[PDB]
Design a protein around this ligand. Sequence first.
Ligand SMILES: Nc1ncnc2c1ncn2[C@@H]1O[C@H](COP(=O)(O)OP(=O)(O)OP(=O)(O)O)[C@@H](O)[C@H]1O
Ligand SMILES: Nc1ncnc2c1ncn2[C@@H]1O[C@H](COP(=O)(O)OP(=O)(O)OP(=O)(O)O)[C@@H](O)[C@H]1O
Ligand SMILES: Nc1ncnc2c1ncn2[C@@H]1O[C@H](COP(=O)(O)OP(=O)(O)OP(=O)(O)O)[C@@H](O)[C@H]1O
Ligand SMILES: [Mg+2]
Ligand SMILES: [Mg+2]
Lengths: 229, 290, 250, 305, 130, 337
Amino acid sequence: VVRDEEGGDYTIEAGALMLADNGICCIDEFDKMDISDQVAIHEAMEQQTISIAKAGIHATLNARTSILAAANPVGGRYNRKLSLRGNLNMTAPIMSRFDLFFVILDDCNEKIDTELASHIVDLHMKRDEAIEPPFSAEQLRRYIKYARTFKPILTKEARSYLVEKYKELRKDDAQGFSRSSYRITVRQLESMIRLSEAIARANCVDEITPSFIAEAYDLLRQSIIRVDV
Amino acid sequence: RVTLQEAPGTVPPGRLPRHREVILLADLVDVSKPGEEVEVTGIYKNNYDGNLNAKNGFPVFATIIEANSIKRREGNTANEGEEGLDVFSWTEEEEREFRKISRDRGIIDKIISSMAPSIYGHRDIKTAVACSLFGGVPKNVNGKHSIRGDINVLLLGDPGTAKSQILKYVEKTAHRAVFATGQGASAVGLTASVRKDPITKEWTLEGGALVLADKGVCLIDEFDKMNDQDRTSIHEAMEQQSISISKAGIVTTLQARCSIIAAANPNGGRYNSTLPLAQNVSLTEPILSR
Amino acid sequence: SVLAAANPIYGRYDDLKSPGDNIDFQTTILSRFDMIFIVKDDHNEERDISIANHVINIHTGNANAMQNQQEENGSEISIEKMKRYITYCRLKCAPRLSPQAAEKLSSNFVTIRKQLLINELESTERSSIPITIRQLEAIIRITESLAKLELSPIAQERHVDEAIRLFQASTMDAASQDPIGGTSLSEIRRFEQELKRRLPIGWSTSYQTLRREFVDTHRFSQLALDKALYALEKHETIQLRHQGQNIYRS
Amino acid sequence: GNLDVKKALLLLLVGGVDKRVGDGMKIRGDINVCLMGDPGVAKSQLLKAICKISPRGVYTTGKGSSGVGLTAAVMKDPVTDEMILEGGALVLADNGICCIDEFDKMDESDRTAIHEVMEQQTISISKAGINTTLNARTSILAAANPLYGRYNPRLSPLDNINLPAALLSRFDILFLMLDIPSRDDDEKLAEHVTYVHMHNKQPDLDFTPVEPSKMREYIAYAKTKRPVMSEAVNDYVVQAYIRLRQDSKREMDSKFSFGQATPRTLLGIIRLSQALAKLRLADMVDIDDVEEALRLVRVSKESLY
Amino acid sequence: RFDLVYLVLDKVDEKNDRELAKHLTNLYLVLPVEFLTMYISYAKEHIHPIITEAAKTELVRAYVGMRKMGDDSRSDEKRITATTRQLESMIRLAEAHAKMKLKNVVELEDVQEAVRLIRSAIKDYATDPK
Amino acid sequence: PSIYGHDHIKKAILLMLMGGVEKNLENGSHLRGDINILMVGDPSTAKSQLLRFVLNTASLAIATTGRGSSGVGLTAAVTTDRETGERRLEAGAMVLADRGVVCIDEFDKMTDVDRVAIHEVMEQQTVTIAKAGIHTTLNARCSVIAAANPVFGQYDVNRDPHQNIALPDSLLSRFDLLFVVTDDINEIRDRSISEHVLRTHRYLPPGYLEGEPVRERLNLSLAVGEQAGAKLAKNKGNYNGTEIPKLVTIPFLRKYVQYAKERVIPQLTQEAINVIVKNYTDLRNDDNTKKSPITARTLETLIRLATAHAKVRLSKTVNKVDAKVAANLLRFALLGE
DNA sequence: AAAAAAAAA
Ligand SMILES: Nc1ncnc2c1ncn2[C@@H]1O[C@H](COP(=O)(O)OP(=O)(O)OP(=O)(O)O)[C@@H](O)[C@H]1O
Ligand SMILES: Nc1ncnc2c1ncn2[C@@H]1O[C@H](COP(=O)(O)OP(=O)(O)OP(=O)(O)O)[C@@H](O)[C@H]1O
Ligand SMILES: Nc1ncnc2c1ncn2[C@@H]1O[C@H](COP(=O)(O)OP(=O)(O)OP(=O)(O)O)[C@@H](O)[C@H]1O
Ligand SMILES: [Mg+2]
Ligand SMILES: [Mg+2]
């Protein structure tokens, strides 16, 4: 909220999340956020709205966004001994907000770095425009906009498989330890539903096959395989 | 006559609002209040102006809107169940139906079970919310003793327990609801504030968040993280039901009849069952007892 | 006149905590005030039963009758008549002191000052509630206000005694309450063994003999009295009867 | 007393080597000296005296008046509010003698202004597209005290000026005035002050053949002569700089760590030798001037103890 | 994220102090003109050199070489000093070297100059250990 | 007379109200002429009451509190005239008090920023305003008396004097005399002060009974107002008999100070100079703990006090007894008896 | 031009 000195403006200014409505917000370097944003985000994410009441003006702004973020582990390099909670400095409620995690590491292997350098050089000078993707950008956009016009549904076997998978995922993680492992909530089941719907959209099918449920469960489980390794 | 801006929820992000002038004839006076989002059906008309022509250098005309109907749209965005200027008004037949269905056995159970029909379990929370939004009876003894007649409710628990969904439903169903959250609310924003009018140039009173909650419920989310200076300004609102301001030569007391429903999270993100409530949260007795 | 309401730190007073860090007001601000009341909550279930009955009756269904009788039997007066009476008394009367009252005030002030010095010397820290000449002026004004009630031109001992009682209440409740704040405790254990060893259950000894013997040893007089009244406060197996001479072990 | 500070002021009034060198490299003839001392040493009185006797002297301080730093005196002045402005400028910064009391008091704006004026640097602060830079060429007179108000037996850079060391290294001469309780000196000071008071006039106890207007004429006369440099002292100043770096080899001995390494020390000793040739001598620079400059530097460092 | 970094450490010695004293005193007692500016403009906007296939092998060898130093005979997992930032550094520096002298294709001398220039700064980046 | 104790404080107040003469030189510029007194002590030790008495008994004085004042408006203000329509300066708090005395309460509680105004004025007794095209130096040669309480609730005798006072050393060095007052608990003094205060409150206005409160009165009967030496009616001043030593009424004291401030301008001699320099040297090289550090300013304070005491006895020359009494007063104010 | 209230650093 900004107001002119002895001025009757009392107007709000829009942050990046507000501008990213119906779009994708790409925040970089997530680690050094401050307390106000650090506590506003987990309200903006789950409830898709932002509420404020300061100096005589109150409003509820729409923040329907799809967030993608990047971060760096504390100490610089990911320590394989510890887990995601040990390395990252983010709070536990923020982690539950996210639906997927990807951890990527670098190494000193001589076979990989040579290929990486060769591929960098080739794109730099030789084939700066001659990359080989299977499909062009325009075709990608056409297919994406065609697939976005589908709303998949769920069948009986899909529901049974989904409840069985949720029961298994809740049970196996709770078998580890008490008061030290707490990562699975109903949000994980909703994330499974959303990911299955997205995968069904990708193949352009109005229904959902338990194979999609299995794939989503595999993704969410390897999200926990990574934290173990 | 009143100034009408654009709702921040419908303006394009990062742009500037547009202002118009609305004229209210008889029976429409004082229906609208400052800071309240409204929807006005009216007639569009134009009239000549001299200075406006002088500044722009072209034959431009001013436009005003004379109101013909006003509908309040604060909080309750759900506007599909029924039509009309107001959705909280009853006909005679609806009163008859109320009396017919208010006498059956076990109506309390039906009322409790019919609240938030898409949330499983949490019977105690539903009962507490019903008892909080139905309220009690204020008491005045000989015009010299005052007893508050509204019930406050505090929620606490682990994440993923759908407290915010309950709060959203409460805001949807209440007649007068105000939503605050986390650190996004200040001490003077909830209570009344003093402001210098840019036109007449003297201090005036600006209605705060709690003032809009008169005969209603005020909802707070992330109650624990809110700073103590931003939390200690609602003690009188909870208990004394009155707001007193002595600032800039103005000494006035403002009445506030609001019920406060709050949600928070314990220390460490989870509730340690083998510890007392005093070591689970950082709140103290003066706030807990209310 | 200023009538201020405040809460101590940590909500409840937390008597186990030292009195120094339960109130955040400085010495300067507290000096101007002259009636400091610390209202503490207590639990004995009889006052609780009484308060519950009082509130339950004061619910509007019943009180609307009973208070009426208070204006019919002349036990109380209405608010507006009290307002008229107070403005009348403020306009008319302005009492004055007498030499006997002045002597009594001077003696009381010296006594309380000496007691404050004793408490400061035992505690070995500055008192969080001070006593200065402002308190003497305060007691004088309390006596004059008490005499002003009956429109008496002259204030006498009958008002001074009640004013002194009020000041004693407001002093012993706040300033001189648990000045000790809870040789160290090595002697404390050493004493308590001797009483059990030498004084069985049901028998008793004179105060003078115990004081004599323990001043003869390393204990001395100052150490004995404090834990004597402590063990009395414990009241588990130590009782006083027959003035301050019979040390009965219950 | 306080003959060293008066000698330093006299050498300041003439100015060091100036008017550039070959290829256009910048050299400034103004000397930047700072005075250190506890309150009650009459450094402010001496500053007032030098300001009064110097026609170009100006006294400033931290705030109190706002139209003195970072802004000119013609802001919003005309009846038409024509907004006449030069942009970044100081008060008579060209060939002026800036005198400041409580040099630790001023805020960030004036401190940044001094950091802009360092070494005759032009003032290039712009607000509304203006770039009328003021060619600042002024001597800096700074009087201040440590924020404790007294000297301490511990490490002396801990006191310094409570200011960044970059600004401290800029100054040419640092002189410390430490109040030492002594009978044989305070007795004379008291006798002189009370004799001044008794006569209600300047005492005859002083013996000065020269008068303030006399030296007012002579300073201009000596500045007019303007001697130039000589070459035969290059080896002497080079070996002096070598032994100064030898001293810097022992700056880690601490407790008076101010003996640090800086080429501006060599530039300042060259400028002070030039001034010691300028004040009285004709168009000639003598080795005795370099020796006197070295002794002045040593005595300035000596007050640390 | 800077491309390069340079450190200057003025330490007290007899020879260097003597040389600076002599040089500064001599100044106190071969350079082109705006020709430089127009030459730079011409290099900027007429000249667009590219790297050749031959320099790719040397670049890969240099990257491997600074990779091979980053580990030793112990399994302590020494610091990874050969980052892709170094790769962009050498490619940009080598291209800029070919930009100079109005050439059109790079040569080996460019890549040796670039690697020497970067590794001179890296060699002075060490702390008290090693 | 209703303030018990504080004898040397009363003596310092008397010397301050009629302080030394100002010295000006064609080459030495300006020399300060008056004396400033600062008091710090634990609460309820009769500082504000004594300050109010000084305000009442002074020929010209202005009352000021630290919290309720702003330094910008305390010296000069710019306001527009309704008739002419131009803007002209308005005199501040102490400009009105030129050649008078300014009394400030809650000195330590004043905002630090406003303190710079004092730093501007007490330095050279001249305030310079430069704002909105106005350039003028305003003369203000007032003397300032202040009373402040220490940082803690009560004074700590076992602590450093510097850490007990919130004010910086720069302004503390300007004040001539520093006085610290504590209410040490002592039953004898408690009884004495108790009976004195109880004596004070048993007072009745003349010609008025005790049963009714004090009522307002009208003005004097005349709108404009206006045998010798044999009466001594209000000369001796001993209105009531309670002690062997004499006492004088306030209006005659005001007449005395009015006569002294104008008719007498004393000069100093070498006999007082010897005592001044000897006591300065002895005080400076005693090398024992003291409340405040000393410097050349303290000797100038001694000279000003000697001149003030040469004025108090209506003599044109300074006697060595004045130097002795000034030295004794300084030693009390800096060491304690 | 000068006093007083509010949000953010
Ligand atoms: N019976 C249920 N109990 C709990 N959550 C439920 C239930 N049924 C459905 N849910 C889902 O649980 C989710 C919980 O939502 P949300 O994250 O807002 O809750 P919360 O943990 O109370 O929030 P907050 O972070 O504000 O404390 C919702 O998406 C809701 O659809
Ligand atoms: N050596 C001295 N000879 C004569 N007068 C002196 C001497 N030292 C100090 N004084 C006296 O000190 C007064 C001015 O010094 P002043 O206190 O302003 O110095 P300062 O060190 O700049 O301190 P501050 O920053 O506190 O003003 C004059 O009254 C002057 O007589
Ligand atoms: N020596 C004394 N003789 C008579 N009255 C005294 C004496 N010392 C204190 N008092 C009384 O103490 C009371 C406190 O007054 P006052 O507040 O002016 O004092 P103070 O020491 O300046 O206090 P503070 O620091 O709170 O401003 C007065 O009513 C005054 O009569
Ligand atoms: Mg000074
Ligand atoms: Mg007082």
